[PDB]
Amino acid sequence: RMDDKRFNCEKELTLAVIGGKWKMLILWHLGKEGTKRFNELKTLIPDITQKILVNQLRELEQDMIVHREVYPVVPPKVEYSLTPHGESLMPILEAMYEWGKGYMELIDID
Amino acid sequence: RMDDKRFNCEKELTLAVIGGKWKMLILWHLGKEGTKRFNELKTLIPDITQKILVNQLRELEQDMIVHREVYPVVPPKVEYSLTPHGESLMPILEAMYEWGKGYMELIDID
């Protein structure tokens, strides 16, 4: 049957949502730390630039992975969190991390 | 600390081992079905060509993901299976598949 083409597309889709080097970092910290403000992510990933960070958060919110919420307190608070889909994505990223550690260990200690 | 750069490299390493459209298919069938002969993979992924399939299996065996074993019976049998690392990689691929299904459902039924 056509079970390969759909397996490929549905695994590829997850890869694109993960994308390049920046999206998975933002998710990782939101998953472990919880809600964070823009400044806080900016400093938890000091390698990231201001312009890149707003672009990645914007794609992630349109991709319904990251939720933005504004609390009109004094002064107002705008904080970022994971959509339920983002949370269901966290185990995968932790699994990939753990496998990378064990495989890098393997490569290193032949 | 430098916890991002190592998280990135160790997640990237897993992505490279997964690589493009062919390596994850071969693993998937070996994980679910078990040991398979070359012909059998060739037919379980009919889209693959002979030349591509031997290249991907060769990278996967050098990457210590796929194990090749020869049984000198009559006539001899050469069969492919997953190294323990390949088996520890299967849950990740099943998780990515399940997340892709639910996220594609989401995209589709807004």
Side-chain angles (χ1 to χ4, degrees), chain B residues 24-38:
Chain B
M24 187 166 171
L25 284 174
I26 298 168
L27 284 168
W28 181 258
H29 287 104
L30 293 183
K32 295 181 81 75
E33 274 96 8
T35 61
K36 290 302 188 180
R37 286 193 287 265
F38 182 85

Side-chain angles (χ1 to χ4, degrees), chain A residues 1 3-8 10-15 17-21 24-25 28-29 44-47 62-65 84-86 88-89 92-97 99-104 106-107 110, chain B residues 1 3-8 10-15 17-21 24-25 28-29 44-47 62-65 84-86 88-89 92-97 99-104 106-107 110:
Chain A
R1 215 157 66 228
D3 316 344
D4 295 352
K5 273 159 64 172
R6 81 202 179 191
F7 178 95
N8 195 12
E10 301 183 5
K11 90 164 176 53
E12 283 286 331
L13 189 66
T14 62
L15 184 151
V17 162
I18 283 316
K21 72 172 290 184
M24 187 166 171
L25 284 174
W28 181 258
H29 287 104
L44 285 170
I45 305 94
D47 196 0
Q62 279 180 348
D63 287 337
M64 292 174 285
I65 305 294
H85 306 282
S88 65
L89 185 59
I92 292 94
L93 306 186
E94 290 190 352
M96 297 175 68
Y97 186 68
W99 197 79
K101 298 184 81 168
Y103 186 74
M104 198 194 75
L106 184 68
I107 303 169
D110 303 3
Chain B
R1 215 157 66 228
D3 316 344
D4 295 352
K5 273 159 64 172
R6 81 202 179 191
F7 178 95
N8 195 12
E10 301 183 5
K11 90 164 176 53
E12 283 286 331
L13 189 66
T14 62
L15 184 151
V17 162
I18 283 316
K21 72 172 290 184
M24 187 166 171
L25 284 174
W28 181 258
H29 287 104
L44 285 170
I45 305 94
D47 196 0
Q62 279 180 348
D63 287 337
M64 292 174 285
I65 305 294
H85 306 282
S88 65
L89 185 59
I92 292 94
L93 306 186
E94 290 190 352
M96 297 175 68
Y97 186 68
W99 197 79
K101 298 184 81 168
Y103 186 74
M104 198 194 75
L106 184 68
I107 303 169
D110 303 3

Side-chain angles (χ1 to χ4, degrees), chain A residues 21-37:
Chain A
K21 72 172 290 184
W22 290 120
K23 288 177 181 173
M24 187 166 171
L25 284 174
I26 298 168
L27 284 168
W28 181 258
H29 287 104
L30 293 183
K32 295 181 81 75
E33 274 96 8
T35 61
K36 290 302 188 180
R37 286 193 287 265

Side-chain angles (χ1 to χ4, degrees), chain A residues 36-49:
Chain A
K36 290 302 188 180
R37 286 193 287 265
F38 182 85
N39 189 359
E40 296 174 345
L41 294 166
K42 182 66 170 63
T43 57
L44 285 170
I45 305 94
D47 196 0
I48 199 166
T49 71

